[PDB]
């Protein structure tokens, strides 16, 4: 909107009321915290959301960081442009005084004049009339400046990491600015989101632009360069494995490019190869790029870092700080099993709880926005773009790590609960510190992080995908550089030919089986429809469900004990994943 001085009106009972004043300068709206207390400001032809606040000094900025930089030099005539409610604007001159506790004008102005600009002879704002003598309220240091984006990053053989911390305006401003630039430059453009719900949020921010969401139910879909493709990471990788009609995108943008999921890692591998070939430009957006090991990064809004005991199971006494908290809380658990116990403990105390996991995310997450709740109990999945209007994060900093055991018959176990990585701790904490609130957001944690993901099964599974992905030219795709030495797996040792490769893709896509487990079955020469391997494993490969031995009724109508030839912990780690794998073993999908 237009630069100048604005009355801040509040629609109350039987009429609007000037609760304050504000100054829009260089594109951002400045005022005082006690006037709007974080609330959104409505304009005809516009919407204004807060971006920065200093509650202690009573200041708040809309649409960017504080930009008023001029200050008052003692013994200088100032001028308060007083905007009193129901009265015409007035220029009042006076000579201000001195400080006392950690420059105040002796002007008596009605309540509602708070936020009126204080101006020197140069017509620059040197402060805001506020705290009733009334102190010339000014920020010690301005922004927190400008953008995070908009160079000539649209060049072949250039890959850009955008380190965008929450509150950056990534989705609302940065991403649509990128797409507009790509379309001006006539670049065939692909956008990659970690989840459907995030992809849907991109569609909203990108409204008005030629965007097309690409379902994984389809191997390829082509109109032309004028259409921008949008899809989940996993969708892109499955297409790379399923189709030879993958378009040679000129610009590939990956959001939440830290996602350690095998499909996501393989995607960053292929993407990087395309950039290297001189074919494409790529942009990886993440607040924790490779090399970032600070659990406590900066945030656009202050975060209170509190370290104390956190329960891993149901409690009965000693943790009143958990349930006495008035606001909303996001709690990160090491597993769904752990999540269910915590959630039930909280629900027993009358707390409304939403639970989140990988497979329930796209159906449960929309409830956090719409319905009213107290706690979110989530797995590491919410480390990829999940946004919450919460004030607190409870983070025991623990997780389960899938590991391929080589001692004895090869199998995948879930090690832990083990301490999370520094990046993950930063992402978890990063759920808060976004939106200015009266009290600082709280990050309640326990334990230190650990850089021990070198034996993580995901890096090997990514290579099982990668050397089963071809490029039209013949070039071999490897892991993204900074991730390349996170596995000791040999290159092209997981390559599959012919129908083996086809089965491998189908075991993953239609079977919903883990990459490792899919690869083992496929390289064995087993057909997709055949499920006899689910019952012919060794006794020690027996699968348990709630302390009881699983017994499946086959498609034929036979009752056999569930006992896979290859054991992968992730297919029985939770009632839902097991329920799914039993549908597979029965041959119902």
């Amino acid at each position: 909107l237009s630069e100048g001085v604005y009355r801040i009106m509040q629609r109350g009972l039987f009429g609007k009321t000037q609760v304050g004043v504000g100054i829009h300068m260089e594109g951002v709206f400045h005022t005082m915290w006690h006037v709007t207390r974080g609330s959104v400001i409505c304009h005809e032809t516009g919407r204004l959301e807060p971006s920065w606040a200093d509650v202690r000094n009573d200041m708040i900025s809309y649409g960017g960081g504080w930009r008023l930089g001029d200050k008052w030099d003692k013994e200088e005539d100032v001028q308060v442009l007083a905007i009193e409610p129901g009265k015409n604007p007035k220029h009042v001159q006076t000579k201000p005084g001195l400080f006392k506790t950690l420059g105040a004008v002796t002007l008596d102005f009605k309540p509602g004049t708070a936020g009126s600009p204080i101006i020197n002879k140069k017509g620059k704002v040197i402060g805001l009339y506020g705290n009733g003598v009334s102190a010339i309220t000014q920020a010690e240091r301005i922004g927190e400046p400008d953008y995070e984006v908009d160079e000539d990053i649209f060049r072949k053989k250039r890959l850009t990491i955008m380190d965008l911390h929450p509150g950056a305006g990534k989705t609302k401003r940065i991403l649509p600015s990128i797409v507009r630039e790509a379309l001006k430059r006539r670049l065939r453009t692909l956008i990659l989101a970690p989840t459907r719900v995030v992809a849907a949020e991109m569609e909203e921010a990108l409204r008005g632009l030629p965007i097309r969401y690409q379902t994984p139910a389809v191997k390829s879909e082509h109109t032309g360069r004028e259409i921008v493709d949008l899809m989940c990471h996993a969708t892109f990788t499955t297409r790379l494995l399923s189709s030879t009609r993958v378009p040679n995108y000129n610009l590939i943008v990956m959001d939440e490019a830290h996602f350690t999921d095998p499909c996501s890692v393989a995607a960053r591998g292929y993407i990087s190869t395309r950039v290297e070939m001189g074919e494409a430009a790529a942009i990886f957006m993440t607040a924790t790029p490779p090399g970032s090991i600070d659990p406590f990064p900066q945030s656009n809004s202050p975060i209170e870092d509190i370290e104390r005991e956190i329960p891993e199971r149901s409690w009965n006494t000693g943790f009143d700080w958990i349930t006495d908290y008035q606001g909303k809380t996001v709690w990160f658990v090491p597993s769904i099993k752990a999540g269910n116990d915590i959630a039930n403990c909280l629900r027993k105390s009358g707390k409304k709880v939403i639970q989140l996991s990988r497979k329930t995310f796209d159906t449960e997450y929309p409830k956090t926005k719409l319905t009213d709740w107290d706690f979110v109990v989530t797995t590491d999945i919410s480390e990829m773009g999940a946004n919450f209007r919460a004030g607190r994060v409870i983070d025991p900093r623990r997780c389960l790590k899938p590991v391929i055991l080589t001692d004895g018959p090869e199998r995948v176990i879930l090690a832990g609960p083990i301490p999370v990585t520094p990046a993950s701790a930063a992402q978890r904490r990063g759920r808060i510190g976004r939106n200015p609130a009266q009290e600082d957001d709280q990050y309640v944690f326990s334990g230190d992080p650990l850089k021990n993901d070198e034996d993580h099964a995901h890096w090997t599974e990514a290579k099982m995908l990668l050397d089963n992905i071809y490029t039209p030219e013949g070039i071999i795709p490897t892991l993204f550089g900074p991730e390349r030495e996170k596995t000791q797996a040999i290159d092209g040792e997981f390559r599959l030919r012919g129908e083996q490769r086809k089965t491998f893709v189908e075991l993953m896509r239609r079977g919903d089986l883990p990459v490792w487990l899919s690869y083992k079955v496929a390289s064995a020469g087993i057909s997709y429809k055949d499920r006899e391997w689910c019952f012919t494993g060794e006794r020690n490969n027996q699968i348990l469900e709630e302390n009881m031995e699983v017994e499946i009724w086959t498609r034929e109508g036979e009752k056999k004990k569930l006992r896979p030839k290859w054991l992968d912990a992730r297919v029985y780690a939770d009632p839902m994943a097991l329920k799914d794998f039993k549908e597979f073993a029965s041959g119902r999908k």
């Binding site: 100048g4 801040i8 509040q10 100054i23």
Partner: peptide
């Protein structure tokens, strides 16, 4: 969520 803006004046010094 019920705040709005109406413009009053511009940043200037008075003669």
């Amino acid at each position: 969520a019920d705040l709005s803006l109406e413009k009053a004046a511009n940043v200037q010094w008075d003669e």
